[PDB]
Symmetry: C3
Subunit: 322 residues, 3 copies
């Protein structure tokens, strides 16, 4: 009966269209490269005011070289002119009553205890320690450099898909509405401007510059490179997303210590101990490309052929049986 092949031909048409759109949708005919080889170079611009001092790129930016990870110092605690010596630590947790509870057995991971219970002040008695004297008082409150919000982060990214030897950069003057020296990344009005306003990045990650500058934090300028190398070089485009990575028992925020080391005319050594709070930026470059390949096109093809081949039989069984 001719209806049997019009039933069969219909079977083939429908089933094969479903399969075809599914595999055509998932690019099963494509091999994929997911090991993006990126190089990141960053440049920060801005000047701020902290106390009655002006902070510039050399002052609040560390490291200075512009790696994929860099810090903009917003707040900082200065313990000026420390000197190797003996002095009572200021932390209440070192509170003692007698030199009997200031032995090595107490606070092992801590600083170096002399073994004397000394009077830091009249209201606290703490174990004495050898080290940079006097000790740091990390419990006071200090201002934050608000100008940092208008600072700007320029991200130049040069990536390479090595499986296809397809290298490209994120500087695209045609894709940017404005000039490169003056544009400013807006996810909508200019999503390819490589210049990000700090405060902008803070918002894109959904965070408040006040609390963030106060406690410090870690943000991620995520650069995504999802590309179809079957298409044009013009189509491999970077998409910027933004997220906070520290999120959140443990106290949020981010701070590190570094000393400026000065020496005296007679030769004794002294340093300015700096506990720095700021915003660390991590440029996370992800990317994956896909090219037409003979092999995955063939495994996907075989898959589709056999699949439709069983579908038409099971459907003959379901229709006939009904």
């Amino acid at each position: 009966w001719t209806i049997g092949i019009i039933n069969r031909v219909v079977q083939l048409l429908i089933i094969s269209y479903f399969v075809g759109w599914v595999f055509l949708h998932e690019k099963a005919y494509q091999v994929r490269d997911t090991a993006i080889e990126s190089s990141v170079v960053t440049k920060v611009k801005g000047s701020g005011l902290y106390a009655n001092r002006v902070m510039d790129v050399s002052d609040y930016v560390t490291p200075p070289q512009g790696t994929s990870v860099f810090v903009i110092i917003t707040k900082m605690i200065v313990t000026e002119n420390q000197m190797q010596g003996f002095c009572p630590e200021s932390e209440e947790k070192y509170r003692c009553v007698s030199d009997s509870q200031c032995g090595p057995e107490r606070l092992p991971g801590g600083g170096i205890l002399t073994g004397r219970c000394v009077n830091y002040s009249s209201v606290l008695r703490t174990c004495e320690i050898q080290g940079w004297c006097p000790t740091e008082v990390d419990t006071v409150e200090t201002p934050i450099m608000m100008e940092a919000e208008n600072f700007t982060i320029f991200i130049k990214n040069s990536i390479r898909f090595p499986l296809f030897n397809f290298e490209k950069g994120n500087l695209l003057p045609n894709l940017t509405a404005r000039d490169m020296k003056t544009c400013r990344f807006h996810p909508d009005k200019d999503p390819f401007c490589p210049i990000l306003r700090v405060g902008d990045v803070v918002k894109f990650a959904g965070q408040d510059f006040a609390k963030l500058a106060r406690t410090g934090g870690v943000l991620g300028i995520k650069i995504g490179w999802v590309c179809d190398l079957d298409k044009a070089w013009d189509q491999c485009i970077p998409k910027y997303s933004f997220t906070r990575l520290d999120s959140v028992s443990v106290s949020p925020g981010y701070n590190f210590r570094f000393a400026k080391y000065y020496k005296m005319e007679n030769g004794s050594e002294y340093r300015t101990l700096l506990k720095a709070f700021g915003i660390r930026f991590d440029v996370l470059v992800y990317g994956n490309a896909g090219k037409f390949n003979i092999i995955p096109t063939i495994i996907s093809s075989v898959a589709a052929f056999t699949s439709v081949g069983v579908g038409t039989v099971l459907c003959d069984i379901i229709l006939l049986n009904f």
Copy 2:
């Protein structure tokens, strides 16, 4: 004969179970993401004693920001108060007899030679050089800061599987037997404590803190994120492994030079030249996840179908022929 389909039905049962367990075992039905997007933040705590000086985080930790790569200085060679000038180098390899063998042709990659053969001491005659005077004597023996062993490395890691947009952190208070502020990673008793005792990491990598602190070395806190995103968020868990990366013609160990730069009241410049030996830590974040997908489930399915389909024929040939 009904035995033919009981022979055939048995064929199908057995062969199909083998194939089924193999593919079910290898998760061939799953697509996999192997491009983990990790952010690493580290914090070291401890104080040590070196000579009659106390070293703290600002002193022995570099860089101070807590990147994925950081150094804990254990030993260091100080050449204090160098000054641009002329002086005889101290290395025997620069030994000369006359200014005839101290020409540019000799030791090209080396320092800057003046061309004079001068008497460094009474027992060595070396070519004179222009630079930081006096020269470094990197052949003496110095102590090591043993307290570093009790120092602690806190690793906060925030990773993201971008193919499934599955981000998660390694801070897991439920998975940790003790509190987070006080736990200590033990591969067995607390394998999810993010705090690693330095000496502990040294042992997990199978190394002796004495020789290591003496010569310096490179260790890897490997964080593995093998995950089945078909399963629960609770199942994506990090596994910490540890390894030494420098291993091993070339001299083992690890050392770098940095100068503390000081200036004089009259304006001449002088620096403290520091050859630092220590332990570099590299947090190597690896990870791969797998989710059920229609496409790999289909290619794997087709594979299994055709495979069993040929197996039953070859087995009919082997049984019948016998």
Copy 3:
């Protein structure tokens, strides 16, 4: 007719050889690992002359620790002895006529403006600013440290393929024609020498050390690890390639600012502001290995079987029809 199976047997022979060589060529029987876990340690050696000063590793290398990203300073602009204070900026773009155009509305991202239009010199009138005084004059011309060309970059790389737990290093004394302490990477005469002459790397990337040292730049020592773990450990070998990553509205080159911070006997603070130009090196470690696997061998096998199975029919149709 026996010719039908000699036609069919020929069909099978030819078609199956084509398919077989194609899949055997693409290693479809192999699973692949593309997430290389590399550790990079670098060491630079050399001394150069800048002005009448000698620069050594501690002077021109930053950071000093030898990460995967490091800078060799070739040129630098010194603004010595800056001091918080008030002074007219020197950039023409801050040119003013009256204090009316030196309000916060002007040059928002810039430094901190006092609001006074002051006379920097007799030929320029600029807005006054609070900060490090005097201001930087980044428009003059300075020399470059040419010795840097003969400097040497030693790259020790320890990678790990985690899907197969296959770790290995790039130090291969057997593969190197000469000793390790004295070899020098030549793509041809010694492609496994881990020591790269700076100038050499500059050439391999197709660049001129003069213009590059003048304006600074970013180069990539690309280490490739393409490996067949079905083969011997001796066959997993690294291949060094070289490329310039900044390439190229925006001004080429690379420069960053850092200050050396000095303090006075009476306590006022002053710094040497350094705008550094040099060559940044990025060791880009890529790698992918492939091992024989049951699963991809099976999907590829099924693929080939069905494929040839349809080929012989379409060819019977093409031959018969002809």
